[PDB]
Amino acid sequence: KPRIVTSEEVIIRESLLPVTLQCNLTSSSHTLMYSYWTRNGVELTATRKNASNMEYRINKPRAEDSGEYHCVYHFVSAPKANATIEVKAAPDITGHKRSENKNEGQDAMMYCKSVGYPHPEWIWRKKENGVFEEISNSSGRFFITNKENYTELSIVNLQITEDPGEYECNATNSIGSASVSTVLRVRSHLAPLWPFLGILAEIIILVVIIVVYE
Amino acid sequence: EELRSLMELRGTEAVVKIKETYGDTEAICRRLKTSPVEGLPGTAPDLEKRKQIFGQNFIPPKKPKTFLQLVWEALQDVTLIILEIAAIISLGLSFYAGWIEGAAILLSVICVVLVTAFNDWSKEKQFRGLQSRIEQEQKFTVVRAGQVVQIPVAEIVVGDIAQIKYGDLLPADGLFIQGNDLKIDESSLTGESDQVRKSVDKDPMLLSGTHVMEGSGRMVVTAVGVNSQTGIIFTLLSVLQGKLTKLAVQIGKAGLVMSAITVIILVLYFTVDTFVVNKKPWLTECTPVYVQYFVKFFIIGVTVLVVAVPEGLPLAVTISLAYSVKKMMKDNNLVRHLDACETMGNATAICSDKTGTLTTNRMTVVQAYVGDVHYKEIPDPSSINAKTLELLVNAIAINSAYTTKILPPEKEGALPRQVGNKTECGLLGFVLDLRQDYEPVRSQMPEEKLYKVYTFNSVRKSMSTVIKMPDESFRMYSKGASEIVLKKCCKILSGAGEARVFRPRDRDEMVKKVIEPMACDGLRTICVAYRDFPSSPEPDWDNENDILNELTCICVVGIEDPVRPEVPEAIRKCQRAGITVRMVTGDNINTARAIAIKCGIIHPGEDFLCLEGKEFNRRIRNEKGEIEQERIDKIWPKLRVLARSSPTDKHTLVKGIIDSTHTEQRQVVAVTGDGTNDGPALKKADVGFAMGIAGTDVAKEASDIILTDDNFSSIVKAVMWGRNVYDSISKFLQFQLTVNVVAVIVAFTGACITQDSPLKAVQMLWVNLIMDTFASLALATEPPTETLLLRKPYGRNKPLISRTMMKNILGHAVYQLTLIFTLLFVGEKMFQIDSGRNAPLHSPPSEHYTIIFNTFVMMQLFNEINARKIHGERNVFDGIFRNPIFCTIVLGTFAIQIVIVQFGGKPFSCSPLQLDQWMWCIFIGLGELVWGQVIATIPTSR
Ligand SMILES: *[C@@H]1O[C@H](CO)[C@@H](O)[C@H](O)[C@H]1NC(C)=O
Ligand SMILES: *[C@@H]1O[C@H](CO)[C@@H](O)[C@H](O)[C@H]1NC(C)=O
Ligand SMILES: *[C@@H]1O[C@H](CO)[C@@H](O)[C@H](O)[C@H]1NC(C)=O
Ligand SMILES: *[C@@H]1O[C@H](CO)[C@@H](O)[C@H](O)[C@H]1NC(C)=O
Ligand SMILES: *[C@@H]1O[C@H](CO)[C@@H](O)[C@H](O)[C@H]1NC(C)=O
Ligand SMILES: *[C@@H]1O[C@H](CO)[C@@H](O)[C@H](O)[C@H]1NC(C)=O
Secondary structure, rough: EEEEEEEOOOOOOOOOOOOOEEEEEOOOOOEEEEEEEEEEEEOOOOOOOOOEEEEEEOOOOOHHHHHHHHHHHHHEOOOOOOOOOEEEEEEEEEEOOOOOEEEEOEEEEEEEEEEEOOOHHHOOEEEEEEEEEEEOOOOOOEEEEOOOOOOEEEOOOOOOOOOOOEEEEEOEOOEOOOOOEEEEEEOOOOHHHHHHHHHHHHHHHHHHHHHHHH | OOHHHHOOOOOOHHHHHHHHHHHOOHHHHHHHOOOOOOOOOHHHHHHHHHHHOOOOOOOOOOOOOOOOOOOOOOOOOOOHHHHHHHHHHHHHHHHOOHHHHHHHHHHHHHHHHHHHHHHHHHHHHHHHHHHHHHHHHOOOOEOOOOOOEEEEEEHHHOEEEEEOOOEEEEEEEEEEEEEEEEEEOOHHHHHOOOOEEEEOOOOOOOOOOOOEEEEEEEEEEOOOOHOOOOOOHHHHHHHHHHHHHHHHHHHHHHHHHHHHHHHHHHHHHHHHHHHHHHHOOOOOOOOHHHHHHHHHHHHHHHHHOOOHHOOOOOHHHHHHHOHHHHHHHHHOEEEEOOOOOHHHOOOOEEEEEEHHHHEEEEEEEEEEEEEEEEEEOOOOOHHOOOOHHHHHHHHHHHHHOOOOOOOOOOOOOOOOOEEEEEEOOOOOOOHHHHHOOOHHHHHOOHHHHHHHHHOOOOOOEEEEEEEOOOEEEEEEEEEEOOOHHHHHEEEEOOOOOOOOOOOOHHHHHHHHHHHHHHHHHEEEEEEEEEEEEOOOOOOOOHHHHHOOEEEEEEEEEEEEEEEEOOOOHHHHHHOOOOOOEEEEEOOOOHHHHHHHHOOOOOOOOOOOOOOOOOHHHHHHHHOOOOOOHHHHOOOOHOOOOOOOOOOOOOOOHHHHHOOOOOOOOOEEEEEEEOOOOOOOOOHHHHHHHHEOOOHHHHHOOOOEEEEOOOOOHHHHHHHHHHEEEEEEEEHHHHHHHHHHHHHHHHOHHHHHOOOOOOOHHHHHHHHHHHHHHHHHHOOOOOOOOHHHHHOOOOOOOOOOOHHOOOOHHHHHHHHHHHHHHHHHHHHHHHOOOOOOOOOOOOOOOOOHHHHHHHHHHHHHHHHHHOOOOOOOOOOOOOOOOOHHHHHHHHHHHHHHHHHHHHHHOOOOOOOOOHHHHHHHHHHHHHHHHHHHHHHHOOOOOO
16 A cells, blocks of 8 residues: 655634645655646646645635645555545635525525535524524425535425525534525515506696696 | 701891701791691600600709618718727727627618618609609690690600790790791890790791790790700708707717716726725736726717707707608698798798689679660660670671680580680670570681781770771770770660760769779679771771770670689688788779678778878889889888789889888798799799789799699698797607606716616617607608697797796606606515616626616607697597608507517516516506696786
8 A cells, every 4th residue: 555645634714825745755666657636626728747745835715715725645556545634624614695586486496605625514593583483394394405515405486474584504613613694575465556556646646637627 | 966056046046047958937847847837747656756765854863862862971970980890999909798899880870871871862852753743734835636635744756836825835846837926035035025026027936944924825835855955054063950950969969978978987996996985906917807897888878868969969960850741732822932831831921813712703794784774783784775795796707806705515514614804705605694695707708808906905904906897987895994995985886786975964964873883882883885987098096095086985894704603711710820911903993892891801800001002102103203112111011902903013112021121020021923024023922823724924033932723722732831840849849858867867967876778779779769750750750730820920030949848858758767766676565576786797788777678668669649739638548540741650660679678688688577467567657647637727927
């Protein structure tokens, strides 16, 4: 089994100092073919060389670079040796729906896509009375789906008295936590009737004035 | 052919030339492959053939411009070019989506140019249609196949035999064959105003473009089209618009200032917030985004400029005319010069002519003095004296012209046709009414017996004939105006069918009993006398003053023309509308006043002068023999009826009235003269009407407007349209100004509180299109109403924007501004649809700004209806359906607006809306009408 010595784990702060990840093939009796880095199982570009010892230089550390890096070693007649260097930072929410407008009796969905490592755990809450309260499954209309980076909350058979409000996703992990919000509003079925009555009233008063004028 | 050199006789050269070539006029007539004076075959192929090769059509094309050059010219606007280059820069700079804005701006500019070009083309087509009809109206009498027929002037071809009467205008160059007393002025070609008398033996040349003065006859056309001696010269060759363009340039300057202020404010705010507040150096990496922000601000400014400045405002009036003239002909007002379409609206005085206008021009007899018995009604032949009918009918038949024949009625149960002299036709109709026929007498009465015929001349004032049928005697029959021949007659035939003693002693009693009642009733008097000349060795008939004396009067006939039933009401309406109508006529003062009192021109119990021409001329020439303005200044204001007036007197009256400074407001007059000598008088006035049914071509040539029915009421119609045009422009202006205010404000403070305007480039271009072009086509073409004659004529120094229009503009602008601001700042809460305020660059369209744009367009559409009334009328929907164009434009704009809001989101910076939002937008639109109804209660005087 080839021996790989890897650099120590790094935490990405807001500091502007670039980061170097190192790994050395200290012991190997096989004819090396190539070596190359991976992030989250994805090949990084322009990384294949002889590279009996390999250095990966990240000039601009951000949360969206933190990941489970490996430097995989492919030999002529030996199994690849991967190893692992973990880079972690506080999670950062990158995309969410700023508003959700649905008529009652339909389906609503809200998602909070983020980046970071460790893959954070997602919690949804409602802003009630100026504070945040954990949602209650109650009738079972709430479907919460969690994934490695993506989460979503879906509501079926939208009512008018509980559903409208503000929902927050909180996304916590070991390094830090990050939360964002979304506003949900449900439209009434008989809303269009009132302005129609207004138009009717204006027509009535206008015709009354005109016929009185004659 | 050789005919081109055959003209320009100018003496007795071309006569010898035609003698050398063919001998005589009949010889060229036969060679011409043309039937002589008796007629013409008139077959279509032969006439069309001789029109192509042997002749030339009168069709100057003038080459009107086509659509391509029109759109090319429309594309030449500077502001549109600036917008185009700004859009190109923004499009290209997007790569160093975003191309959507540039593509939309390009397409909208192209569409606007196309629409403007189409509008101009349609207006020009309307004008060409009017010109085609004005050309069609012309007609000349010729003879073909032995039948006298009237044909369009464009149709005459070489060889046609044309009949020439006094006052006609010669259309083509021809040769004289037969006629009498053909005297024509040729001053238009030779410069000499002397009446050249044409004869077969001395000058048989007739030239087109010359005015026939006296005589009649026939001619054979030789040269037509550009081959004529008048076409060679051609081949080798308002008040309102000034105010409109002044207002346009003022508003353009204001808009330019506003646009510059907005752009500099945006740039300063952006640079101060980005660099001074936030500590950022002049980085070269973010230069493209900074210059893109600058280009966006510049595009906002350019759009503000392109909406603020009014383009095509001075062209508004023309549009109205282009959609009014074709309807004015329905009121029998055929207009030649468009400049008089609106000037007649300001007209304050109308000078009218008696015959033709106020009368029917038909002669009907009611009362007659015969047998020393007055008859208020037509008497039967039973009650009459001895030998008087036979002699009277014989004298009437012989003395009157034979060529004039009363046609059989054949009018499908209507009045019989009258041809010839009016008074003569009246006498013949009276004879036929008395159960006597003059045809048997005239058929057996040969022309040789009438050796001497004195035709009615101005000097002699009588018309008479002599026959030598009696043995050792002669019989003469005379007709006169009952004043000239009354002095001549010295015996009374009405005693017992025999002559009596007539003296100056009973001259007073007879003139009091006869002339005064007919004159009071409004009847011109015609007297018929006869005498028996003895067979002297040599009577001196040359001196008709003395030889034609000692007559016997057969009877006296009073003849008159009924006054039309429409003239009284029209005159009353004109006097109500601040226009004074005077009357000028050549008849005697008594009958003139009798007609005027019935027509309502002069009130019974009022001190209106009715002086005749003699006293008029004497009063204005009490000096050494010249006319001064000061003397006229005391005569014209109170002169109603003028009698025995030569046309030069009418010209003098018009000149004196038009340039007088006696009153504070300059006078504009309308004279309706018709005659061969009515040239200068008609031309001097501002607008000169002419007669259509019976009018000399010389009068029609120099007249601005012609009446195809001769009725006076038609003149009134002109006045109506002459006012309507002005009102139309007025109302259009109102609407536009309102929009032009709100837009500017909504883009200035919008660029001051925030960094963007609620309306983007394409939306504001659509607003510009709807506010200018469709508004001009919808509001500026409205039908006139009869209430336009209830206000006094407008002065010259009247401000273009009245107080009521300013009130309407300010009130509607205030309402629109407050509602749009409320929707912009607070409308996030009311609809619960988030906020588009402070949107980042390339932000997706948001409902918050789509609501603002939609409600703005809806307010404009529903305020366009409210702008149709200028004088504060509350019934905004009064007479809306009479103009289909307005309804079509409003409904089409509404449908296109719905399509634009619902679909085509990103290019137009709009987002789809639900029924709730649309319902509130329409609610606001109708609230606009409610506020417009409310504002009318504010008193503008206080
Ligand atoms: C790198 O080159 C060395 C020296 O030839 C060799 O031992 C090693 O296997 C190579 N590694 C590769 C090709 O990945
Ligand atoms: C890791 O490899 C690099 C690159 O060759 C070398 O400089 C460094 O000394 C190596 N470190 C160890 C501990 O072998
Ligand atoms: C390398 O192999 C190990 C075997 O335990 C595996 O866990 C790891 O994920 C592999 N690395 C990559 C990048 O696939
Ligand atoms: C809520 O209860 C329903 C019951 O069917 C279930 O489908 C849903 O997954 C539950 N979970 C959450 C997190 O709301
Ligand atoms: C989440 O991870 C998956 C791994 O397959 C990737 O395809 C997807 O783009 C990721 N989404 C992010 C990082 O927002
Ligand atoms: C998330 O939730 C945890 C647990 O309630 C809390 O400590 C943290 O402040 C929350 N905040 C964010 C920003 O995620």
